[PDB]
Design a protein around this ligand. Sequence first.
Ligand code: CL
Ligand code: K
Lengths: 90, 91
Amino acid sequence: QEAHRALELLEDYHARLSEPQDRALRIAIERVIRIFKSRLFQALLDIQEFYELTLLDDSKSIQQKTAETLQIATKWEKDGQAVKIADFIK
Amino acid sequence: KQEAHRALELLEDYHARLSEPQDRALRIAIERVIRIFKSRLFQALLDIQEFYELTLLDDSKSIQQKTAETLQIATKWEKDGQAVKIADFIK
Ligand SMILES: [Cl-]
Ligand SMILES: [K+]
């Protein structure tokens, strides 16, 4: 169970599922993989957006960049431990 | 450039280049961002590990049950942008 290889292992399990009676599972796994990649991509865009808006803008002082960096850490730390209670349609 | 896959690499590089003492508080704050982001990634990968070990590698579950659990997990992720998620909530 090495965390950095968890998706690799799932990919390899997918590759091994070739029997017709396992095909609905294989398609469901393909959907997990797609949605997981989208989660990772969105997470990376969170870094890209911070990097652009805060760190590359050479009109912001080091002090302002620091403040913005501290606020994003604070926010992400809260998000990290937040618990879902509901979702809303559309 | 903004190749998304390289976002953390570029952040790490910016951190490495912030070496003047008047930039040090910004350097420390960026290192905190990097730690917190890597922890987010690590928990996400544990979500897959937990699924793999508890659903897929459990030989006592039928294919039907494994399919249902697989669909469930992706649906939850799919709904996360419309989710109400409360920080520091009551136990
Ligand atoms: Cl995430
Ligand atoms: K998340």
